[PDB]
Design an enzyme around this catalytic site. Structure first.
Site, PDB file in Angstrom:
ATOM      1  N   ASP A   1       0.859  -1.198   0.000  1.00  0.00           N
ATOM      2  CA  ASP A   1       0.000   0.000   0.000  1.00  0.00           C
ATOM      3  C   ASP A   1       0.891   1.242   0.000  1.00  0.00           C
ATOM      4  OD1 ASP A   1      -2.122   1.935   1.052  1.00  0.00           O
ATOM      5  OD2 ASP A   1      -3.324   0.133   0.941  1.00  0.00           O
TER       6      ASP A   1
ATOM      7  N   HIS B   1      -3.549   5.845   3.869  1.00  0.00           N
ATOM      8  CA  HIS B   1      -4.382   4.634   3.945  1.00  0.00           C
ATOM      9  C   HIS B   1      -3.540   3.402   4.272  1.00  0.00           C
ATOM     10  CE1 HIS B   1      -3.435   4.385  -0.281  1.00  0.00           C
ATOM     11  NE2 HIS B   1      -4.172   5.493  -0.508  1.00  0.00           N
TER      12      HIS B   1
ATOM     13  N   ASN C   1     -13.648  -1.127  -5.564  1.00  0.00           N
ATOM     14  CA  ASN C   1     -14.696  -0.172  -5.146  1.00  0.00           C
ATOM     15  C   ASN C   1     -15.493   0.318  -6.378  1.00  0.00           C
ATOM     16  OD1 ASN C   1     -12.257   1.284  -2.899  1.00  0.00           O
ATOM     17  ND2 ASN C   1     -13.664  -0.419  -2.474  1.00  0.00           N
TER      18      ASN C   1
ATOM     19  N   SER D   1     -10.403  -2.030   0.657  1.00  0.00           N
ATOM     20  CA  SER D   1      -9.078  -2.075   1.300  1.00  0.00           C
ATOM     21  C   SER D   1      -9.242  -2.384   2.787  1.00  0.00           C
ATOM     22  CB  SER D   1      -8.363  -0.746   1.163  1.00  0.00           C
ATOM     23  OG  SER D   1      -8.070  -0.521  -0.195  1.00  0.00           O
TER      24      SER D   1
END
Ligand SMILES: [Ca+2]
Length: 281
Positions: free
Chosen positions: A32, A64, A155, A221
């Protein structure tokens, strides 16, 4: 005071913590934006940056990766939140630059890093719309080497009758995770298709943020983070289970929700998964 985010309770992680199963010595790579190593509620063990311009994987500009890390392994203490696997060995693998973007080479390099450094679990909280022979080869190699590979489904929500599952979640070797809310209803943004394996909490998820902060994010996520942590709890109880067995344990002990195209097998229950793998026998 420490707060247990509702999503950690919803997947039944505290039942295993009370038995002394906390993910100890299980290596989890968060592939990430990096992980803030200065956060008092996170213990980062190692990692690497694959971003040429950004050599420090412990500088999290996009926030994130630190949030996913906290869902996997925020520490059990008197502050902050609590991870699914609070004793896990957390590894920051930075594959996204400060601008938000990540070349496919950087992500594949991160997966190769994770195999070379003997990660037990890889969490990929990113998707692309397209795959490649090299991305498939890297996740297939990781699963061949014994790694549990978990990814966000995406998403992209619903699109007609099409699969909207992103890569590498769309590959069979990778556990693709969609998002439910606290009511166990699918989140409208959660990607759909026959590649979906399981759901986990992905809306209003409280976790660690850089600079000794906390806050809520939403996304597959976040959902993927719960499943990566759950795999770490399972390996702490069952160190000689194969990755195939850990995957079956999560898929075969879900709380059934709606149709498989929208929910896969349903919501993970790590308490039930830790009873038996249900792979063949
Ligand atoms: Ca804490």
């Amino acid at each position: 005071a420490q707060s247990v985010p509702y999503g950690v309770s919803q997947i039944k992680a505290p039942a295993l913590h009370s038995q002394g199963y906390t993910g100890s010595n299980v290596k989890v790579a968060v592939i990430d934006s990096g992980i803030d190593s200065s956060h008092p509620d996170l213990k980062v063990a190692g990692g690497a940056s694959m971003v040429p311009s950004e050599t420090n994987p412990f500088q999290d500009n996009l926030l994130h990766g630190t949030h996913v890390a906290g869902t996997v392994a925020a520490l059990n203490n008197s502050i902050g939140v609590l991870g699914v696997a609070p004793s896990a060995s957390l590894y920051a693998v930075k594959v996204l630059g400060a601008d938000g973007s990540g070349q496919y080479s950087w992500i594949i390099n991160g997966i190769e890093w994770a195999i070379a450094n003997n990660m037990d679990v890889i969490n990929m909280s990113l998707g692309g719309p397209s795959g490649s022979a090299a991305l498939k080869a890297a996740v297939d190699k990781a699963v061949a080497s014994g790694v549990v590979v978990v990814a966000a489904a995406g998403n992209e929500g619903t699109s007609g009758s099409s699969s909207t599952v992103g890569y590498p979640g769309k590959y069979p070797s990778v556990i693709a995770v969609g998002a439910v809310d606290s009511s166990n209803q699918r989140a409208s943004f959660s990607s759909v298709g026959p590649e979906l394996d399981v759901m986990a909490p992905g809306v209003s998820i409280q976790s660690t943020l850089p600079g000794n902060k906390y806050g809520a994010l939403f996304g597959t996520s976040m959902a993927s983070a719960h499943v990566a942590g759950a795999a770490a709890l399972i390996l702490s109880k069952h160190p000689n289970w194969t990755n195939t067995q850990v995957r079956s344990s999560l898929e075969n002990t879900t709380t059934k929700l709606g149709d498989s195209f929208y929910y896969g097998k349903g919501l993970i229950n790590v308490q039930a998964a830790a009873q038996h793998h249900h792979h063949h026998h």
